[PDB]
Ligand binder design. Sequence first.
Ligand SMILES: *[C@@H]1O[C@H](CO)[C@@H](O)[C@H](O)[C@H]1NC(C)=O
Length: 728
Amino acid sequence: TLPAFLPCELKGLVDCNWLFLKSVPRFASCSNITRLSLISNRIHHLHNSDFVHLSNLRQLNLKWNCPPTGSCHMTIEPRTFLAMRTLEELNLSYNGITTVPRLPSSLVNLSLSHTNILVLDANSLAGLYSLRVLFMDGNCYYKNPCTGAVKVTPGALLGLSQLTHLSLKYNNLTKVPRQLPPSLEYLLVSYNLIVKLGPEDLAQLTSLRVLDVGGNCRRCDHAPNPCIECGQKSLHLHPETFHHLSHLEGLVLKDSSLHTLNSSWFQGLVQLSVLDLSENFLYESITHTNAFQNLTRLRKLNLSFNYRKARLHLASSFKNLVSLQELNMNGIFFRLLNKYTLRWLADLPKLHTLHLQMNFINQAQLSIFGTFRALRFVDLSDNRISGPSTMDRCKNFKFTMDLSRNNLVTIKPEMFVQLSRLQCLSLSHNSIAQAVNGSQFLPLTNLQVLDLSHNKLDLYHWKSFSELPQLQALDLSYNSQGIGHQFSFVTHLSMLQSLSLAHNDIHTRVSSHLNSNSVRFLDFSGNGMGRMWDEGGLYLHFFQGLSGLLKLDLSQNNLHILRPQNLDNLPKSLKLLSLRDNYLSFFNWTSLSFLPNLEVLDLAGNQLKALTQGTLPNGTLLQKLDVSSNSIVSVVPAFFALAVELKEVNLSHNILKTVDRSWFGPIVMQLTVLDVRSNPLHCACGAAFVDLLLEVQTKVPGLANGVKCGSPGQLQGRSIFAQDLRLC
DNA sequence: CCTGGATGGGA
Ligand SMILES: *[C@@H]1O[C@H](CO)[C@@H](O)[C@H](O)[C@H]1NC(C)=O
């Protein structure tokens, strides 16, 4: 009858996360479960018999059960994990242990990160010959401190003949552990105190695919958090350090205080696809160096935050990065962008992504991005661009350009010269105060998406955005305002499918009618539709002219009433309506006859005291009803009974003491969701709601533990299964 | 490596 795995939830996974458990649950048969998650409980002691009932486990997560500062120490009996002979993955992270427990040989992945284990020797990982993955980060650093440092004894890991991944970050290491297994494909030793590297440190590691050695010589300028500055001026790299790494696909040297590069570092890495040079002092290097000469397979290059301690121009060697797909140049702080600055990138055949934000650019010739071969995304957000030189997804597929958070006060169509192939643009969070009239975006003949939110557009002109013949989505949200009429242009936008006028300063001379044959989605939330629909018949047909409209969002409009007339005069094509977060107290549910094709209705966050008015009227096509976070106290029988297509209903965060089956009739059997959490259910031993929820248990989210009682006081705040309610 | 610009994940 009951779910078999109380107080946990069965996903062959069983989820016991965040249940304040102090011991491993014992729960018909527990011999078919293979995965158990106990994340962030209170288990502080583990014992030889704790997992005996879970003999066939393959995966075990115990993260955050006994967190070190920030105090907790975990005790583990010797035979604890041995009961699980087929155990493959074990996560022991964020637990105060000082030694690694005894483990079965079937182990494959192991996490020991953020513990108090300070020493790894040959005895620590005994019998783990099939171990492929070992993580142990953050055992000795400012958030999990230790006197001295973690010590990995030379050759301790050589028993792991199958090891591919090894991470030992934030451990205050001063050297790379010696004689590591040569089978390694991933080595991460970043953010220790390794101020010196050479071929000795990486000896015998010929199967390395990525290597992370960043943060070992940190500049700490404007560091928000406790940081250890490198004693020397820079990381010391022996010229032949990585020279024997013939499979190296990834190298990260971030925050290494590098002042110059050296071409010797890369000349052996003929598979190098990823290079992270961010957070060093290469401002002058990147402009002159020849190091990029033979990085032929290089796909990703991170140059971010290499700022000056002239005019920026990338080195000529960049023209050899024929495989380059992505370039990060954020936070470099060069105030001028021109035809030279990036010239050696233009002929690069596959360069699609260019990151150029947080650079304090106040002069930019955007035309240069029209000369590029395969550019798909250029981010110029958070800069100081103020004019011509002297919904965004758009993801992966559309020539997109982001000019968010700049200093545009006026749009002059000459700033878009050569950008005519742009399909998406964002000018949000500028300070554009300008009466749009149709002369601002002429070159943008192919623009499909335009984000102009958080500006100060005057929108009286009916010719607005008419020079954008392919415009499909327009975001004018959070726009702050004696001729024309507000929003008159919508009818003259032939292809507009999505529009947002959310949170706008609406004028008195706002148009009384919105029109379009193409608009399918309108966000009109955060406006004054309550004060507009109280003005009589003036705005009674405000939305009627949007023929074909499918989705309307009328959230946060301070609606206290919703007459049938206003409903009847919405487009008959409507399928989704959201009145979320209004002040609707009473509502005639039979008035949904006026929305014949309505499929989804969201009335969450209103004052619906009850569901009485009122009945879901046949033959509504309503599939989803959301009445969460009202203060519903009751519902009339057969309320949902006539909604033959009803699948989802959310009654959460109300104040029902029960949930009755007579509310639904035969419909409740087909419900896909029935969310009843956060209700003060009265858990008397008679209660029949438990018999109802149990009938549709799979369709009830958080049933096993998330649905709580509100009374009686001893069962309050506790699950409806805390005591067995079916006994009287 | 991914993520952000700091640090934690990871498999
Ligand atoms: C029901 O509404 C609440 C409101 O906060 C939300 O948290 C919850 O996710 C919703 N349930 C479903 C099934 O969407």
